[PDB]
Amino acid sequence: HCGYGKHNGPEHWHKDFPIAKGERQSPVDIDTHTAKYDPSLKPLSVSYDQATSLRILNNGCAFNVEFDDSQDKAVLKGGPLDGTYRLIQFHFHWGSLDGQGSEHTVDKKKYAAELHLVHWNTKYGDFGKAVQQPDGLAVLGIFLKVGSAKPGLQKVVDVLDSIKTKGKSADFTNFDPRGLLPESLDYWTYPGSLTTPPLLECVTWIVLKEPISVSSEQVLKFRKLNFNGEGEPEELMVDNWRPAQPLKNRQIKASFK
Ligand SMILES: [Zn+2]
């Protein structure tokens, strides 16, 4: 029962998941002055044209927008990656206040939220096998700041009322995740982990430098979700983020100068 409260938050997770104190945990602070431009990084390729979204689920920790990954319909390639990674879901982490909510930080700056587009390496055949491998997943991370509304986010915001509590799901077809990307695909990359239990060290992180802007009203609706199940005492789904973890023996590489 790991979670985000005082008694079961991130600082407690290591008791159930000893890898929480491992050598390649995420998120991390991205020190922009220490990251190294890597001329070898090939360009990043986000091919979401045939993306097939299916459902949106409140899983008690965030909400997940799930995709049909039974075929290469929406994939991530290039950049630091070898091979083809299939989109399986995206989710966010966000704060109680506009000054916090992101998992990664940039020169210790926290953003209001962070989008994770989760992809698995097709050479491992399924998601469950992929998470057991050091190069199993590629997660595209996108910062959110509060400013102008993001039109491509609004279809998500408007369905949240129907998945308020843990375990609720709703149909979420014909959603285009391209609407959540910033203009630039300049990124930072490093090897890390899932940022929730089981905290598996199976992720190539690709974090976009350019944030997207969402409106105050949009993030406010995120904060009206619930960690709890229906008919339970209400605990707002806020501050579902893990703080920065020790970089240890890792170098963050930049795709840009
Ligand atoms: Zn995440």
Coordinates of C-alpha atoms and ligand atoms in Angstrom, one line a residue:
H1 CA 0.0 0.0 0.0
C2 CA 2.7 2.5 -1.0
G3 CA 1.3 6.0 -1.8
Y4 CA 2.0 9.7 -1.3
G5 CA 0.7 10.6 2.2
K6 CA 2.8 11.2 5.3
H7 CA 2.7 7.6 6.5
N8 CA 3.2 5.8 3.2
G9 CA 4.8 8.4 0.9
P10 CA 8.0 8.0 -1.2
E11 CA 10.3 8.0 1.9
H12 CA 8.6 4.8 3.0
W13 CA 8.7 2.9 -0.3
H14 CA 12.2 1.4 0.3
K15 CA 10.8 -0.9 2.9
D16 CA 8.6 -2.7 0.4
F17 CA 10.8 -2.0 -2.6
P18 CA 14.5 -2.1 -1.7
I19 CA 15.4 -1.0 -5.2
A20 CA 14.1 2.5 -4.1
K21 CA 17.7 3.1 -3.0
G22 CA 19.2 1.6 -6.1
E23 CA 21.8 2.9 -8.5
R24 CA 19.5 4.1 -11.2
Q25 CA 16.4 5.6 -9.6
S26 CA 14.1 8.3 -11.1
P27 CA 13.3 11.1 -11.2
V28 CA 16.5 13.2 -10.9
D29 CA 17.3 16.9 -11.0
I30 CA 18.6 17.9 -14.4
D31 CA 21.5 20.2 -14.0
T32 CA 21.5 22.0 -17.3
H33 CA 25.1 23.2 -16.9
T34 CA 26.4 19.7 -16.3
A35 CA 24.4 17.9 -19.0
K36 CA 26.6 17.1 -22.0
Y37 CA 25.6 17.7 -25.6
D38 CA 25.9 14.3 -27.4
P39 CA 26.5 14.6 -31.1
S40 CA 25.9 11.0 -31.5
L41 CA 22.2 11.2 -30.6
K42 CA 20.2 10.4 -33.7
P43 CA 17.0 12.5 -34.2
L44 CA 14.0 11.5 -32.1
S45 CA 11.0 10.0 -34.0
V46 CA 7.5 10.2 -32.5
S47 CA 5.1 8.4 -34.8
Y48 CA 1.7 8.8 -33.3
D49 CA -0.4 9.0 -36.5
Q50 CA -2.2 5.7 -36.0
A51 CA -2.5 5.9 -32.2
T52 CA -5.5 4.1 -30.9
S53 CA -6.6 5.2 -27.5
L54 CA -9.0 3.0 -25.6
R55 CA -9.7 3.9 -22.1
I56 CA -8.9 6.2 -19.2
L57 CA -8.5 4.8 -15.7
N58 CA -8.1 6.2 -12.2
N59 CA -5.8 3.7 -10.6
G60 CA -5.5 5.4 -7.2
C61 CA -2.2 6.9 -8.0
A62 CA -2.8 8.8 -11.2
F63 CA -5.1 8.5 -14.2
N64 CA -3.9 6.4 -17.2
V65 CA -4.9 6.9 -20.8
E66 CA -4.4 3.4 -22.3
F67 CA -3.7 2.6 -25.9
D68 CA -4.0 -0.4 -28.2
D69 CA -0.4 -1.7 -28.3
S70 CA -1.2 -5.0 -30.0
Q71 CA 0.5 -3.7 -33.2
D72 CA 3.0 -0.9 -34.0
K73 CA 0.3 1.9 -34.1
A74 CA 2.1 4.6 -32.1
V75 CA 5.8 4.3 -31.6
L76 CA 8.9 6.0 -30.4
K77 CA 12.2 5.5 -32.2
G78 CA 15.5 7.2 -32.6
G79 CA 17.2 9.5 -30.2
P80 CA 19.1 7.3 -27.7
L81 CA 17.0 4.3 -28.5
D82 CA 17.7 1.1 -30.4
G83 CA 14.7 -0.4 -32.1
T84 CA 11.0 0.3 -31.7
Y85 CA 9.1 1.2 -28.6
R86 CA 5.3 1.0 -28.5
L87 CA 3.1 3.5 -26.7
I88 CA 1.0 1.7 -24.0
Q89 CA -0.3 4.5 -21.8
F90 CA 0.3 8.1 -20.6
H91 CA -0.3 9.6 -17.2
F92 CA 0.6 12.7 -15.3
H93 CA 2.0 13.7 -11.9
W94 CA 1.0 17.0 -10.4
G95 CA 0.9 19.2 -7.3
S96 CA -1.4 20.8 -4.8
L97 CA 0.0 24.2 -5.9
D98 CA 1.4 25.6 -9.2
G99 CA 4.9 25.7 -7.8
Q100 CA 5.2 21.9 -7.5
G101 CA 4.1 18.7 -9.1
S102 CA 6.8 17.6 -11.5
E103 CA 9.1 14.7 -10.8
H104 CA 12.1 15.7 -12.8
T105 CA 13.4 19.2 -11.9
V106 CA 15.5 21.5 -14.1
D107 CA 18.2 23.3 -12.1
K108 CA 16.0 22.4 -9.1
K109 CA 13.0 24.1 -10.7
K110 CA 9.8 22.3 -10.1
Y111 CA 7.0 22.6 -12.7
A112 CA 3.3 22.3 -12.0
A113 CA 3.0 18.9 -13.5
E114 CA 4.8 16.3 -15.7
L115 CA 3.4 14.1 -18.5
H116 CA 4.8 10.6 -18.9
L117 CA 4.2 8.8 -22.3
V118 CA 5.2 5.2 -21.5
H119 CA 6.6 3.0 -24.3
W120 CA 7.9 -0.6 -24.3
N121 CA 10.6 -2.3 -26.4
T122 CA 8.9 -4.5 -28.9
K123 CA 11.8 -7.0 -29.0
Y124 CA 10.6 -8.2 -25.5
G125 CA 7.1 -9.1 -26.9
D126 CA 5.0 -7.6 -24.0
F127 CA 5.1 -4.9 -21.3
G128 CA 5.4 -7.3 -18.5
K129 CA 8.6 -8.8 -20.0
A130 CA 10.0 -5.5 -21.0
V131 CA 9.9 -4.1 -17.5
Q132 CA 12.3 -6.9 -16.4
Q133 CA 15.0 -5.5 -18.8
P134 CA 17.4 -2.5 -18.5
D135 CA 16.3 -1.3 -21.9
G136 CA 12.7 -2.3 -21.6
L137 CA 10.9 1.0 -21.5
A138 CA 11.2 4.5 -23.0
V139 CA 9.4 7.2 -21.2
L140 CA 8.9 10.6 -22.9
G141 CA 8.6 13.2 -20.1
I142 CA 7.0 16.6 -20.7
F143 CA 6.8 19.4 -18.2
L144 CA 3.6 21.4 -17.7
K145 CA 3.5 25.0 -16.7
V146 CA 0.5 27.1 -15.8
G147 CA -0.3 29.7 -18.4
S148 CA -2.5 29.5 -21.5
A149 CA -4.8 26.6 -22.0
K150 CA -3.7 23.5 -23.9
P151 CA -6.5 22.7 -26.3
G152 CA -5.2 19.2 -26.9
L153 CA -5.6 18.5 -23.2
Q154 CA -9.2 19.5 -22.8
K155 CA -10.7 16.2 -23.9
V156 CA -8.8 14.6 -21.0
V157 CA -9.9 17.3 -18.5
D158 CA -13.5 16.9 -19.5
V159 CA -13.7 13.2 -18.8
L160 CA -12.1 13.4 -15.3
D161 CA -15.5 13.9 -13.6
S162 CA -16.4 10.4 -14.7
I163 CA -13.4 8.8 -13.2
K164 CA -13.2 10.6 -9.9
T165 CA -12.4 7.7 -7.6
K166 CA -9.9 4.8 -7.6
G167 CA -11.0 1.9 -9.9
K168 CA -13.3 4.0 -12.1
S169 CA -12.7 3.8 -15.9
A170 CA -14.3 5.3 -19.0
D171 CA -14.2 4.9 -22.7
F172 CA -11.6 7.2 -24.2
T173 CA -11.3 6.5 -27.9
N174 CA -10.0 8.7 -30.8
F175 CA -7.8 10.8 -28.5
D176 CA -4.7 12.1 -30.3
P177 CA -1.6 12.4 -28.1
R178 CA 0.1 14.6 -30.6
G179 CA -1.9 17.4 -29.1
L180 CA 0.1 17.2 -25.9
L181 CA 3.6 17.8 -27.5
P182 CA 5.5 21.0 -27.4
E183 CA 6.9 22.6 -30.6
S184 CA 10.5 21.4 -30.0
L185 CA 11.6 17.9 -29.5
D186 CA 15.0 18.9 -27.9
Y187 CA 15.6 16.6 -25.0
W188 CA 17.7 15.4 -22.1
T189 CA 18.3 11.6 -21.7
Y190 CA 19.5 9.3 -19.0
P191 CA 19.0 5.7 -17.7
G192 CA 16.6 5.4 -14.8
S193 CA 13.5 3.8 -13.3
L194 CA 9.8 3.8 -13.0
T195 CA 8.9 6.6 -10.5
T196 CA 6.3 4.4 -8.7
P197 CA 6.5 1.0 -7.1
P198 CA 7.8 -1.4 -8.2
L199 CA 10.4 1.2 -9.2
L200 CA 12.0 -1.1 -11.7
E201 CA 15.2 0.0 -13.3
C202 CA 14.1 -0.5 -16.9
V203 CA 13.6 3.0 -18.3
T204 CA 15.5 5.1 -20.8
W205 CA 14.2 8.6 -19.9
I206 CA 13.7 11.2 -22.6
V207 CA 12.7 14.5 -21.1
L208 CA 11.7 17.4 -23.3
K209 CA 13.3 20.7 -22.7
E210 CA 10.3 22.7 -23.8
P211 CA 7.3 22.7 -21.4
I212 CA 3.7 22.8 -22.6
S213 CA 1.4 25.4 -21.0
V214 CA -2.0 24.4 -19.5
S215 CA -4.4 26.7 -17.8
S216 CA -5.0 27.1 -14.1
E217 CA -8.5 25.8 -14.7
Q218 CA -7.2 22.7 -16.4
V219 CA -4.8 21.7 -13.6
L220 CA -7.5 22.6 -11.0
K221 CA -9.6 19.8 -12.5
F222 CA -6.7 17.4 -12.1
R223 CA -6.7 18.3 -8.4
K224 CA -10.4 17.4 -8.0
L225 CA -9.7 13.7 -8.5
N226 CA -9.6 11.4 -5.6
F227 CA -7.0 8.8 -4.4
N228 CA -9.8 7.0 -2.6
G229 CA -12.5 4.7 -3.8
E230 CA -16.1 5.7 -4.2
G231 CA -17.9 6.0 -0.9
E232 CA -14.7 6.4 1.0
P233 CA -13.5 9.5 2.8
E234 CA -12.2 11.9 0.2
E235 CA -8.5 12.4 -0.2
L236 CA -7.7 14.7 -3.1
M237 CA -5.4 13.3 -5.7
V238 CA -2.6 15.9 -5.4
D239 CA 1.1 15.8 -5.0
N240 CA 1.4 12.3 -6.6
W241 CA 5.1 13.0 -7.4
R242 CA 8.3 11.4 -6.3
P243 CA 11.1 13.8 -5.5
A244 CA 14.5 13.9 -7.1
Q245 CA 16.7 10.9 -6.4
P246 CA 20.5 10.7 -6.3
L247 CA 22.2 10.7 -9.7
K248 CA 24.9 8.3 -8.6
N249 CA 27.1 7.0 -11.5
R250 CA 25.0 8.6 -14.3
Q251 CA 25.5 11.3 -17.0
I252 CA 22.6 13.2 -18.4
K253 CA 23.0 13.8 -22.1
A254 CA 21.5 16.7 -24.2
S255 CA 20.3 16.4 -27.7
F256 CA 20.9 20.1 -28.3
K257 CA 23.6 22.8 -27.8
Ligands
ZN1 ZN 5.0 8.6 -14.2

